[PDB]
Design a protein around this ligand. Structure first.
Ligand SMILES: C=CC1=C(C)/C(=C/c2[nH]c(/C=C3N=C(/C=C4\NC(=O)C(C)=C4C=C)C(C)=C\3CCC(=O)O)c(CCC(=O)O)c2C)NC1=O
Ligand SMILES: *[C@@H]1O[C@H](CO)[C@@H](O[C@@H]2O[C@H](CO)[C@@H](O)[C@H](O)[C@H]2NC(C)=O)[C@H](O)[C@H]1NC(C)=O
Ligand SMILES: CCCCC/C=C/C/C=C/CCCCCCCC(=O)O
Ligand SMILES: CCCCC/C=C/C/C=C/CCCCCCCC(=O)O
Ligand SMILES: *[C@@H]1O[C@H](CO)[C@@H](O)[C@H](O)[C@H]1NC(C)=O
Ligand SMILES: *[C@@H]1O[C@H](CO)[C@@H](O)[C@H](O)[C@H]1NC(C)=O
Ligand SMILES: *[C@@H]1O[C@H](CO)[C@@H](O)[C@H](O)[C@H]1NC(C)=O
Ligand SMILES: *[C@@H]1O[C@H](CO)[C@@H](O)[C@H](O)[C@H]1NC(C)=O
Ligand SMILES: *[C@@H]1O[C@H](CO)[C@@H](O)[C@H](O)[C@H]1NC(C)=O
Ligand SMILES: *[C@@H]1O[C@H](CO)[C@@H](O)[C@H](O)[C@H]1NC(C)=O
Ligand SMILES: *[C@@H]1O[C@H](CO)[C@@H](O)[C@H](O)[C@H]1NC(C)=O
Lengths: 49, 247, 233, 50
C-alpha cells in the first residue's frame, strides 16, 4: 500500500489537498488501478494454492 | 455511518506577510544578479492586493491556485528581478532562451508560483533607463537556482584577453527602457515564490479559523493542511522534537 | 599517504519520522573501504561533495573556504568558527596565499551573511540545487594515527541558500592534528531505521557478493542455501 | 541572442532544452506574415480564418 505507482504520492489525502478535480482524478486513477491489480494477484495466488 | 463534524487546527500566527515590502520596493535587481529572500512566520492572505496590485502573469506549478487558502507551507523563498516584456514566458520549467540559459534557470520538478507585473511608470524614463543588464555570452549553461555575477571579458577561444582586442566582448548588455516603445520592450517585475510542502513545522500559513477539538467521533480533521477522516484518541507515543506527524 | 574509510560517512538523505524500516536507494554516498587522502595547504578539488574528518585535540583547524577560482573575480563562501561565534559569509574575498585562524583583504558585492551564537569531527558537504547541505557528527576517539573503524551516522545541521558553483575548497589552519578527505560517488545503499527514527545499520550493495545478496534479499539475516542476485556490481 | 527576440517560441514533439544534443534528419522552414491576433491560430487543433 506504500507504492505510489507513478503518481505524485502514495497518500490519497495529499493528492486531494493540493490539486484540482480534473488533475486529481488522473492521479487517483493510477493508485486505484495499481491496488486493484495487486489485489487480483493475491486472489489468483490463493486460488492456485 | 457518515461523518458529522469538522476539526481545524492551525498554528497561532497573527502577522501579515510583507506584501508591501516585497511587491512595492524602491528598486529591483537585474536578472543576472537576482535576489533571494527568506519568508517565514506570517499569514499569506493576499486579499489586500486586490485593490493595489494587478498581475499580468500568475501561474502556479505543483499546486492549485484555489487550494492556497487552506494549505500551510513549510519553507518559502522569494526571488525578485526585472526582465522585459518578451522574456516573461522564459520564466518557466523546460524553457530555452537567453534568460533561461545564462541568467535564471528553474528546476524541472518545481513547486511554487511565478507572478509578474508591468511597471512602465516607475522603471522607464523618457531619455532611457540603461540600468538593468543581462548576460548574453557564457561558456555553458547554468544549473538550477544558481547565479553568475562575474564581469570578466569574454572570448570564444577560451583564454583571457584585453577587450581592446578584436575577438573580445563584454558579456553584459543593457536593457534600453523607454516610455515610447511597444509592449514587448517594457519593464516587467518578476517574483518567483518557491516552497516545499509537509516536511517540517509550518511557519507561513493560511487565513483559516481554528476549531475546538472533538474526541471519539468520526470527524474530518485538518492539521496544517493534512485533511483526513477518522476518530481522535489521546496518545502515549513520544515524538522526536520538531516532527509533526508519523505514518 | 592514503588510508581506508571503513564503514564511515553515512548521513540522512531525507526527513520523515520513520519507525522500524529498511530503505534501498542510490545516491551520492561514500563507498565502504574506499581510499581517503590524509594530511597530517593545497586547494583540494570539490567534485560532487566531500566527507571531511578532523582528528584534533587543540582545535587548530578553523572552518573552510569553498569557491570556484579562489580569486576576487568570483563568489566564495567562508564558514569559520572564531572564539565566540560561528560565522558564514558569502562574498568576493581577496583569497590570500596562506590563511590564518584577516583571511580576506576586502569584501564587496555580496549577499549572504549569517552569525550564530583527542577527538574526531566528521562533516559531509553536498552542493545541489543552489543549496549547500552540511551534516555534522562527533566522535570521542582515543590516541591513533588513522581513521578508526566504526559506523556513526551524521546529523543534518544546516542547508544554505547560496547559488554558486563549488569546484575547489581549502581548509583553514591556525599558525598535532590531522584531517582526511574522501569523495562521494553515486552508489546503492540500504539503510535500517529503528523504533526511534535513527539510523542503526547500513550496507553498500557494490562492495561484496554477500552484501549484494543482502541487498537483493532486502534483509540483514539470510539462511543456508543458494540464491540469485541482481546487478549492483 | 543579441539580434532577434521572439514574442512566440513553442515546440511540439520535443523539449526546447534537448535541442542542442539532438541531431535532425529533414528540416523544412515555412515563412509568412500574419497580424497580432492570428499568431495563436498557428497551432495544431485550432480553428479560425487562418
Ligand atoms: C565552522 C564550522 C563549524 C560548525 C558548522 C559547527 C557546528 C557546531 N559545533 C558545536 C559544538 C562545538 N564545536 C566547537 C569547535 C569546533 N567545531 C569544528 O568543526 C571545528 C573545526 C572546531 C574548532 C574550532 C566548539 C568549541 C563547540 C562548543 C562545545 C565544545 O566545547 O566542544 C555546535 C553547538 C552544539 C551544541 O551546543 O549543542 C555547533 C552548532 N562548529 C564549527 O566549527
Ligand atoms: C564553476 O567553475 C568551473 C571552473 O571555473 C566551471 O568550469 C568551466 O567550464 C567551462 C565551460 O566550457 C570550461 O571551458 C572551463 O574549462 C571549465 N573550467 C575548468 C577549470 O575546468 C563551471 O562551468 C562553473 N559552473 C557553472 C555552473 O558554470
Ligand atoms: C533556420 C535553421 C533551422 C535549423 C534546424 C532547427 C533546429 C532547432 C533550433 C531552432 C532555433 C530556435 C531559436 C529560438 C531559441 C533562441 C531564441 C530565444 O528564445 O532567445
Ligand atoms: C451565439 C450562438 C452560440 C451557438 C452555440 C455555439 C456553438 C459553437 C460556436 C462557437 C462560435 C465560435 C466563434 C469563434 C471562432 C471563429 C472566430 C475566429 O477564431 O476567427
Ligand atoms: C483599496 O485601494 C483604494 C485605492 O484608492 C482605496 O481607496 C481603498 O480604500 C482601498 N480599500 C480598503 C479596504 O482600504
Ligand atoms: C588507493 O587506490 C589504489 C588504486 O588506484 C590502490 O592501489 C591503493 O592501494 C589504495 N590505497 C590504499 C591505502 O589501499
Ligand atoms: C581584485 O584583485 C586585484 C588583484 O588580484 C586587484 O587589482 C583589484 O583591485 C581587486 N578588485 C577590487 C574590486 O578591489
Ligand atoms: C568573530 O568574528 C565575527 C565576525 O565579524 C565578529 O563579529 C566577532 O566579534 C568575532 N569574535 C571574536 C572573539 O573575535
Ligand atoms: C560589483 O562591483 C563593481 C565595482 O567593483 C560594480 O560596478 C558592480 O555593479 C558590482 N556588481 C554587483 C552585482 O554588485
Ligand atoms: C525508542 O522506542 C522505544 C520503543 O518505542 C522506547 O521504549 C524508547 O524509550 C525509545 N527511545 C530510546 C532512546 O530508545
Ligand atoms: C551583439 O549585437 C550587438 C548589437 O550592437 C553588438 O554590438 C555586439 O558586438 C554583438 N555581439 C557580438 C559577440 O558580436
Amino acid at each position: 500500500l506504500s507504492s505510489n505507482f507513478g503518481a505524485i504520492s502514495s497518500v490519497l489525502n495529499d493528492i486531494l489537498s493540493r490539486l484540482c478535480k480534473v488533475e486529481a482524478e488522473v492521479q487517483i486513477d493510477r493508485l486505484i488501478t495499481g491496488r486493484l491489480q495487486s489485489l487480483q494477484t493475491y486472489v489468483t495466488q490463493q486460488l492456485i494454492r | 455511518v457518515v461523518p458529522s463534524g469538522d476539526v481545524v487546527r492551525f498554528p497561532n500566527i497573527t502577522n501579515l506577510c510583507p506584501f508591501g515590502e516585497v511587491f512595492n520596493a524602491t528598486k529591483f535587481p537585474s536578472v543576472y544578479a537576482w535576489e533571494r529572500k527568506k519568508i517565514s512566520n506570517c499569514v499569506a492572505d493576499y486579499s489586500v492586493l486586490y485593490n493595489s496590485t494587478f498581475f499580468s502573469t500568475f501561474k502556479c506549478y505543483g499546486v492549485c491556485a484555489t487550494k492556497l487558502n487552506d494549505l500551510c507551507f513549510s519553507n518559502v523563498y522569494a526571488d525578485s528581478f526585472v526582465v522585459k516584456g518578451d522574456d516573461v514566458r522564459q520564466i518557466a520549467p523546460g524553457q530555452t532562451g537567453v534568460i533561461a540559459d545564462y541568467n535564471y534557470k528553474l528546476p524541472d520538478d518545481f513547486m511554487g508560483c511565478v507572478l509578474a507585473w508591468n511597471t512602465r511608470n516607475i522603471d522607464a524614463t523618457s531619455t532611457g533607463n540603461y540600468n538593468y543588464k543581462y548576460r548574453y555570452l557564457r561558456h555553458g549553461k547554468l544549473r538550477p537556482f544558481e547565479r553568475d555575477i562575474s564581469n570578466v571579458p569574454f572570448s570564444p577561444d577560451g583564454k583571457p584577453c584585453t577587450p581592446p582586442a578584436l575577438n573580445c566582448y563584454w558579456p553584459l548588455n543593457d536593457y534600453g527602457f523607454y516610455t515610447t516603445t511597444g509592449i514587448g520592450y517594457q519593464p516587467y517585475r518578476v517574483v518567483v515564490l518557491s516552497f516545499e510542502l509537509l516536511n517540517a513545522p509550518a511557519t507561513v500559513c493560511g487565513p483559516k479559523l481554528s476549531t475546538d477539538l472533538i474526541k471519539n467521533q468520526c470527524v474530518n480533521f485538518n492539521f496544517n493542511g493534512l485533511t483526513g477522516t477518522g476518530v481522535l484518541t489521546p496518545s502515549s507515543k513520544r515524538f522526536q522534537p520538531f516532527q509533526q506527524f508519523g505514518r | 599517504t592514503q588510508h581506508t574509510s571503513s564503514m564511515r560517512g553515512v548521513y540522512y538523505p531525507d526527513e520523515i519520522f520513520r519507525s522500524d524500516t529498511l530503505y534501498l536507494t542510490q545516491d551520492l554516498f561514500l563507498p565502504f573501504y574506499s581510499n581517503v587522502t590524509g594530511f597530517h595547504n593545497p586547494v583540494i578539488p570539490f567534485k560532487d561533495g566531500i566527507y571531511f574528518a578532523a582528528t584534533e585535540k587543540s582545535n587548530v583547524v578553523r572552518g573552510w573556504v569553498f569557491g570556484s577560482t579562489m580569486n576576487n573575480k568570483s563568489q566564495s563562501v567562508i564558514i569559520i568558527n572564531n572564539s565566540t561565534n560561528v560565522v558564514i559569509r558569502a562574498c568576493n574575498f581577496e583569497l590570500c596565499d596562506n590563511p590564518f585562524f584577516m583571511i580576506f583583504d576586502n569584501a564587496f558585492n555580496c549577499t549572504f551573511e549569517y552569525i550564530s551564537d583527542k577527538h574526531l569531527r566528521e562533516f559531509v558537504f553536498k552542493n545541489k540545487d543552489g543549496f549547500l547541505y552540511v551534516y555534522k557528527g562527533y566522535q570521542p576517539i582515543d590516541v591513533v594515527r588513522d581513521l578508526p573503524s566504526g559506523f556513526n551516522t551524521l546529523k543534518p545541521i544546516f542547508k544554505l541558500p547560496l547559488g554558486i558553483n563549488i569546484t575547489n575548497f581549502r581548509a583553514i589552519l591556525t599558525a598535532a592534528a590531522a584531517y582526511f578527505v574522501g569523495y562521494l560517488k553515486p552508489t546503492t545503499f540500504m539503510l535500517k531505521y529503528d523504533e526511534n527514527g535513527t539510523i542503526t545499520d547500513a550496507v553498500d550493495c557494490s562492495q561484496n557478493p554477500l552484501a549484494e545478496l543482502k541487498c537483493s534479499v532486502k534483509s540483514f539475516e539470510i539462511d543456508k542455501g543458494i540464491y540469485q542476485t541482481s546487478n549492483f556490481r
